[PDB]
Amino acid sequence: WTATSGSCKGRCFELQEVGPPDCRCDNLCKSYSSCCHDFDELCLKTARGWECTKDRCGEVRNEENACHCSEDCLSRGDCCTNYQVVCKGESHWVDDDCEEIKVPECPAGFVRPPLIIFSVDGFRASYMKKGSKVMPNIEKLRSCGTHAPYMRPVYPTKTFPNLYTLATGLYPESHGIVGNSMYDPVFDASFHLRGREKFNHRWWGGQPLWITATKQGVRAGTFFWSVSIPHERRILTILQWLSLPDNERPSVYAFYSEQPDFSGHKYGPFGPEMTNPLREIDKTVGQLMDGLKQLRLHRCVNVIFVGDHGMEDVTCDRTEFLSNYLTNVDDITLVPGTLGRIRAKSINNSKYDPKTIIAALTCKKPDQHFKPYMKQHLPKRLHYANNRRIEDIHLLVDRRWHVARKPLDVYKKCFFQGDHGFDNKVNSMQTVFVGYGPTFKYRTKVPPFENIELYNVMCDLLGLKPAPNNGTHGSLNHLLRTNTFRPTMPDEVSRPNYPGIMYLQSEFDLGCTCDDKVENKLEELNKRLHTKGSTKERHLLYGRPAVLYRTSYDILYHTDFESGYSEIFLMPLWTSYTISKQAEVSSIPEHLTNCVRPDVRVSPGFSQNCLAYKNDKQMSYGFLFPPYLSSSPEAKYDAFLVTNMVPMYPAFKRVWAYFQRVLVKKYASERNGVNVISGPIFDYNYDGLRDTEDEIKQYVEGSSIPVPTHYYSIITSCLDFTQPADKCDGPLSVSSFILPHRPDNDESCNSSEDESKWVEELMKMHTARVRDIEHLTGLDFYRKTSRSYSEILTLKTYLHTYESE
Numbered sequence: 001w002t003a004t005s006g007s008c009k010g011r012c013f014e015l016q017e018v019g020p021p022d023c024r025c026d027n028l029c030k031s032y033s034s035c036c037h038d039f040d041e042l043c044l045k046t047a048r049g050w051e052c053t054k055d056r057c058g059e060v061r062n063e064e065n066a067c068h069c070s071e072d073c074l075s076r077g078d079c080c081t082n083y084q085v086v087c088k089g090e091s092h093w094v095d096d097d098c099e100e101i102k103v104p105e106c107p108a109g110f111v112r113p114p115l116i117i118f119s120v121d122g123f124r125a126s127y128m129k130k131g132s133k134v135m136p137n138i139e140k141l142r143s144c145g146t147h148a149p150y151m152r153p154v155y156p157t158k159t160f161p162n163l164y165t166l167a168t169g170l171y172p173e174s175h176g177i178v179g180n181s182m183y184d185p186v187f188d189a190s191f192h193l194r195g196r197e198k199f200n201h202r203w204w205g206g207q208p209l210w211i212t213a214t215k216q217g218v219r220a221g222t223f224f225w226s227v228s229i230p231h232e233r234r235i236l237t238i239l240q241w242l243s244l245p246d247n248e249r250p251s252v253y254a255f256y257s258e259q260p261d262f263s264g265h266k267y268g269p270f271g272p273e274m275t276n277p278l279r280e281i282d283k284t285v286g287q288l289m290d291g292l293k294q295l296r297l298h299r300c301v302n303v304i305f306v307g308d309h310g311m312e313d314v315t316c317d318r319t320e321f322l323s324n325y326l327t328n329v330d331d332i333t334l335v336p337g338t339l340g341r342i343r344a345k346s347i348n349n350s351k352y353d354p355k356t357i358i359a360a361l362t363c364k365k366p367d368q369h370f371k372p373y374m375k376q377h378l379p380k381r382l383h384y385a386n387n388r389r390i391e392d393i394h395l396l397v398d399r400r401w402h403v404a405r406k407p408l409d410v411y412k413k414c415f416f417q418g419d420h421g422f423d424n425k426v427n428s429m430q431t432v433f434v435g436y437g438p439t440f441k442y443r444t445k446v447p448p449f450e451n452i453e454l455y456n457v458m459c460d461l462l463g464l465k466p467a468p469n470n471g472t473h474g475s476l477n478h479l480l481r482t483n484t485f486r487p488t489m490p491d492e493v494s495r496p497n498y499p500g501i502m503y504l505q506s507e508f509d510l511g512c513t514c515d516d517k518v519e520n521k522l523e524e525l526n527k528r529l530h531t532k533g534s535t536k537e538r539h540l541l542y543g544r545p546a547v548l549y550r551t552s553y554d555i556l557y558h559t560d561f562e563s564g565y566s567e568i569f570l571m572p573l574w575t576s577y578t579i580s581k582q583a584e585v586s587s588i589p590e591h592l593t594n595c596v597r598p599d600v601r602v603s604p605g606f607s608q609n610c611l612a613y614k615n616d617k618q619m620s621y622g623f624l625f626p627p628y629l630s631s632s633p634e635a636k637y638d639a640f641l642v643t644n645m646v647p648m649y650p651a652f653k654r655v656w657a658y659f660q661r662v663l664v665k666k667y668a669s670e671r672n673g674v675n676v677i678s679g680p681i682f683d684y685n686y687d688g689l690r691d692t693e694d695e696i697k698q699y700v701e702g703s704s705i706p707v708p709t710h711y712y713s714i715i716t717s718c719l720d721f722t723q724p725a726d727k728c729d730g731p732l733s734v735s736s737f738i739l740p741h742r743p744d745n746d747e748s749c750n751s752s753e754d755e756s757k758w759v760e761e762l763m764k765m766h767t768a769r770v771r772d773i774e775h776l777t778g779l780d781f782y783r784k785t786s787r788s789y790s791e792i793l794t795l796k797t798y799l800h801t802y803e804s805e
């Protein structure tokens, strides 16, 4: 209920929200059907339009006008944005040359540079170049400020999840807005764009920037605008707020444009109809910058121009129908479109089985344009699983396509030529970032980065302490002239033991065998040096990873590799080795095919055993350091140590063997040597975080050998590939993956073929950031380099995407 009988006189676009039932005058009142009766009359004036003309200059003030060109307009703060250009001989901001802003130049009374976030929906990254001829204002911000070639959105590349990610620094699984449409089974409530459930605070997790600001004494403009408020009025309102008295004036503001998304859906990303929407957004940026110039704020305010996601070509005819795959189509609910989420139609259905649904959706048609997954099996880079609103069954839809339940859903509810929502590494989904102002760098290009990082920087720009988020604070310090956050390395929690030879062969009863009984003072001294770490500098190039949780582990040294061996999980947490460009791949000799060797540095009680693998009919084993890359026949025996063994499904061994036998050498050759760190991951509760021992759901049968959910590798080399990985003087280059440890290769529709036709395609889909492996392992990598810590933080956030340009 709302008593619309109050008045907005002197209250237009007030900042505090007045409580029910009293009528509101804030920028969101329309959206709640709650504005005072005279809100339109008083607050949404339109008369004479938005621009001053020659003949209005000096006019007597008429308060019915949308904006003013009277002599008193600057003092009142309500001039049309082009007032000083038209009436006082000034230039538009876009016509002034770019001049470095070395220090904030702010009027008296301004305690910090304000932040203005100008967000644009559906603004695909390639617009910045392809539309640059019709967006002069945006091009000036881009070229003169700090810009990325693109910014990576979160998955799904939908509007609500991305905007709230920008505002919170959180993955959708964590902030709760995991799609534009959701069902929450605990609430038993549905969230959708159209309706009022979406206004309930219970959906909205984390702590968005405007709340972080307010709790810490930094006043915020109200970030949300009812859709009918025209852009010119949003810009005028922001400018009015900026002329408020110091005590009353916000320091952070948001503007939002529904374009170019709105037109992109109708016309496709590059339809001829798209030029006008881009001109219009640019015009709006020009109005804002001119208005800041009038207020003497254009060299004081930090402006962020940022998008939520891109736009792809998508038409009705490119739709896959679940009715062509499932018999039981009426027993499911599909959330459709550029992603699919499936759940049972009724919880009283006893005959609902996800496994049958998945199988009926797996590799059924040759050109199939979607792939089903249990959500825990999605690529971990997506971070799209740990929320009760994400359905167990997910369909990753190919770019350019839709999935729907039945054909009648697509003509009873073409027209649209664009859509978004696909995998966030897809080029067409990439979006924009530009920062301009005293706190940002001048004429600086920075590499692509992920939108989850921005909340930290916005907090940095305002002097705020960020709420806990998924950003890596400091990884974007290279965007800033000042206000950087100087993080320190986390402290190591567990120190390693350095075991020497402590056990005789006969103390072990592992049921393993190896044909290794054949055997100086010469190299016998050398093999002793090797076991004490004499070659460690070659194979551990950036220091030992630090263990950031309490545990018991041993550093083990070898000629060709070093490892951190966990006595709790009975396998290495990490195994580190360097392969030079000149390295030679060799076979496993016939007499060593099944060789496993007890490690005389590690007790029988903390070792795996071969008997468990023999008796577990589903589970085989693999090695972390690959025997195929031994430096010599004698060193090869180290690779068969029981302490280098890890459990692997035969199906997964196909992938792992091809990576180790073929791809590592390929990478060393292409990158001029590589350093590889490999290890297991345990994430049975799919929360992106290292599992404790009591969360492990599966062991090698009859034993305490835990089965990893994933195996990772971090592959580092010199960015300047004219230097070898092991003698690099400058920045590093990295690529990593988190491969799911699955008992089949159903994920790969061509897996019956030779590994050369499908394994690398799988690894690419499962590319990861080092930071992702850190969360999943409780390890901290790159502890000892010659590089600045922030550069290293950036490296750890890097994702190698394998997309074209």
Ligand SMILES: *[C@@H]1O[C@H](CO)[C@@H](O[C@@H]2O[C@H](CO)[C@@H](O[C@@H]3O[C@H](CO[C@H]4O[C@H](CO)[C@@H](O)[C@H](O[C@H]5O[C@H](CO)[C@@H](O)[C@H](O)[C@@H]5O[C@H]5O[C@H](CO)[C@@H](O)[C@H](O)[C@@H]5O)[C@@H]4O)[C@@H](O)[C@H](O[C@H]4O[C@H](CO)[C@@H](O)[C@H](O)[C@@H]4O[C@H]4O[C@H](CO)[C@@H](O)[C@H](O)[C@@H]4O)[C@@H]3O)[C@H](O)[C@H]2NC(C)=O)[C@H](O)[C@H]1NC(C)=O
Binding pocket: 170, 171, 173, 174, 175, 176, 202, 203, 204, 205, 206, 383, 386, 387, 388, 468, 469, 470, 687, 688, 689, 775
């Ligand atoms: C990305 O960054 C984010 C933010 O840093 C990381 O998320 C954090 O991870 C922590 C570990 O998982 C987690 O810490 C827990 O907090 C619990 C209380 O949390 C509430 O209060 C906070 C603070 O304001 C609030 O933010 C939380 O918000 C969640 O839930 C609300 C609804 O209540 C949602 O609106 C919101 O979106 C959010 O949901 C998200 O997180 C929850 C988990 O909290 C998920 O379930 C959702 O799907 C969604 O992802 C909460 O309101 C606290 O109770 C926990 O402590 C338990 O465990 C410890 C273990 O030592 C133990 O000491 C305690 O006893 C306790 O166990 C007891 O409860 C158990 C469960 O019922 C029970 O099994 C036991 O037997 C015990 O009874 C814990 O401290 C933190 O909440 C989140 N923060 C956020 C914002 O999500 C995230 O990890 C990062 N991602 C990556 C990959 O790095």
Ligand SMILES: Cc1nonc1CNC(=O)C1CCN(c2cccc3c2C(=O)N(CC2CCCCC2)C3=O)CC1
Binding pocket: 028, 031, 117, 119, 159, 160, 161, 163, 164, 166, 167, 208, 223, 224, 225, 226, 227, 254, 256, 306
């Ligand atoms: C019905 C209704 N209620 O309010 N307004 C309307 C009508 N308008 C819309 O529907 C717009 C499109 C969705 N939209 C969202 C959606 C979900 C989360 C956020 C936003 C948003 O703008 N910000 C601010 C960040 C923008 C990006 C920069 C950081 C802050 C979020 O956090 C902005 C409003």
Ligand SMILES: [Ca+2]
Binding pocket: 682, 683, 684, 685, 686, 687, 688, 689, 690, 691
């Ligand atoms: Ca976990």
Ligand code: NA
Binding pocket: 745, 746, 747, 748, 749, 750, 751, 752
């Ligand atoms: Na297959």
Ligand SMILES: [Zn+2]
Binding pocket: 122, 159, 261, 262, 265, 420
């Ligand atoms: Zn859209």
